[PDB]
Design a protein around this ligand. Structure first.
Ligand code: ZM3
Ligand code: ZM3
Ligand code: SAH
Ligand code: SAH
Ligand code: MG
Ligand code: MG
Ligand code: MG
Ligand code: MG
Ligand code: MG
Lengths: 250, 251
């Protein structure tokens, strides 16, 4: 009902393309191209056009986490690791824009090349799963220039959006952010999840949020539990939908 | 900057599909399917997907007219005659929503089946132009159910949106609105333009806005001048882009 509420609601419907309802790619457990409302609502399909695949439930979660951090004065930036066409990061920048927040940045981290080719340095679960095999099938490889273009279409490409192009094992250890209020992990594999927990989670502020988009994937879950056990983290894992979970760092 | 400004800016980019940049139909003077920014900015193409064809310049004009009416206390509702997929009316309802206006309605008037077949009763300029020829080529026929569906996708289908299905010569004389603050005419022909000026313009409040979307079309322009001459209307005709004009009613 307020201007902010209307803007953020529309931005969610737009980045997920509930407006025009694009077909999905046929891959994984999706056997037909037709737009299905329930699949887009819960982020389960592979949009041919939409700027995010995370769906409405995970967009609502991202809004909750960012708004809570702002409300509670939790310091730091927003980082997404694994951005595809950029829609979740566009939405995050839009939240900051709606509240006229000028002192936080959205960090946009990706290979900008899709999933990595498997080698003998990969975890066996990642090697077996071989996510790389799906790159073309779901149009995953999306260049930095394309993602920048997408931000610009919403009027949200500015100096509060910064990009971290490369493999997370290479980009995360020396990424230039000092503090995070929201760490959103969407890289699917054991490797991508462990890379980012290892190298970015220590910069997550107390009261900040750690979102695991791909917790339904066994390899991803494996990394989450290994990392939490190592660090003695017992913060409640709260389920969002059939894919994602999050916790709030105590 | 403000939530309202951000919402309405996004709503314009969305109904015109600057976000996903759908191809155009190849028709009229548009010779290629590719999205062209300048063509969508000025409302010159025939979107395959977008909910409005009027473009950013005419969306900005609609915003200016509605906001001015609200600011100045001009009484009445908003009517668009010729809505296609509904996007300009969706945007109008969004403007009212952004300002929490609860006492005005957006009236959505169309045949919901494209241009009418020409008959012997048509003006000779309309007969020659024969807009009916283009219906399928640019996917013009769009049912009431489809337009309602489109409103719902934005969360804007509610009791402040009312529909007037049928030919304007049938629906306008007894349309139930009492007063208009904005009258947006987008029916292309002499006939549709004269139908709406004849039967809806008298309900346009002083200080209200009359928008002629299709003024570049000779038959439409003919109707505009005939009507203005008949009624002694000399309110300045202000050009928006390469298609549309508007005036503000002084009397
Ligand atoms: C198509 C791409 C996708 O691929 C699959 O969806 C693969 C699915 C396999 C076919 C599945 O196997 C089948 O299950 C059946 C129940 C039984 C079958 N049989 C034994 C006969 C068996 O063949 C699955 C369960 C295999 C397991 C290991 C799995 O969870 C894999 C995930 C892959 C995700 C990838 C990557 O998409 C990512 O996904 C996460 C969850 C999203 O947020 C998002 O980031 C998205 O990126 C855009
Ligand atoms: C394809 C549908 C469209 O068709 C045309 O765009 C036809 C164009 C003709 C080809 C044109 O002719 C050409 O001009 C050249 C200058 C010279 C050419 N040659 C002699 C060399 C001649 O061939 C035009 C100028 C003909 C004149 C009579 C005209 O203005 C017709 C309008 C028809 C509009 C219709 C209906 O679309 C409506 O359009 C108005 C302007 C929009 O807001 C919108 O509501 C839209 O609905 C969605
Ligand atoms: N090790 C790694 N390093 C960098 N990027 C990676 C990676 N493994 C996967 N990726 C990227 O992780 C993404 C997974 S899909 C991300 C979906 C996105 N958050 C949305 O809103 O739709 C892809 O863009 C892929 O290129
Ligand atoms: N005589 C008549 N009566 C009712 N509707 C008519 C008509 N002549 C044309 N129309 C309608 O006028 C419209 C012209 S195109 C309208 C474009 C629309 N305003 C937009 O925002 O894109 C079509 O939807 C067509 O069905
Ligand atoms: Mg090796
Ligand atoms: Mg690795
Ligand atoms: Mg994911
Ligand atoms: Mg007639
Ligand atoms: Mg027109």
């Amino acid at each position: 009902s307020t201007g902010v509420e209307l803007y953020l609601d529309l931005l969610k419907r737009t980045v997920s393309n509930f407006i025009y309802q694009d077909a999905t790619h046929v891959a994984g457990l999706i056997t037909q191209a037709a737009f299905v409302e329930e699949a887009r609502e819960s982020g389960e399909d592979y949009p041919t056009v939409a700027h995010t695949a995370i769906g409405m439930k995970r967009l609502n979660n991202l809004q909750h986490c960012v708004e809570s951090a702002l409300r509670d004065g939790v310091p730091g930036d927003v980082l997404e690791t694994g951005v595809w066409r950029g829609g979740a990061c566009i939405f995050a920048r839009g939240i900051l824009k709606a509240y006229d927040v000028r002192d936080r940045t959205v960090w946009v981290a990706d290979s900008f090349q899709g999933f990595p080719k498997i080698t003998d340095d990969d975890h066996p679960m990642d090697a077996e799963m071989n996510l790389h095999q799906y790159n073309a099938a779901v149009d995953l490889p999306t260049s930095l220039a394309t993602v920048q273009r997408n931000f610009s279409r919403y009027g949200l490409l500015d100096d509060q959006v910064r990009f971290l192009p490369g493999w997370f094992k290479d980009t995360m250890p020396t990424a230039p952010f000092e503090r995070l209020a929201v760490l959103r992990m969407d890289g699917d594999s054991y490797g991508a999840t462990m890379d980012v927990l290892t190298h970015a989670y220590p910069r997550l502020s107390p009261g900040g949020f750690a979102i695991i988009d791909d917790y339904c994937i066994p390899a991803c879950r494996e990394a989450v539990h290994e990392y939490r056990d190592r660090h003695g983290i017992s913060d409640e894992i709260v389920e969002i939908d059939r894919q994602g979970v999050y916790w709030r760092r105590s």
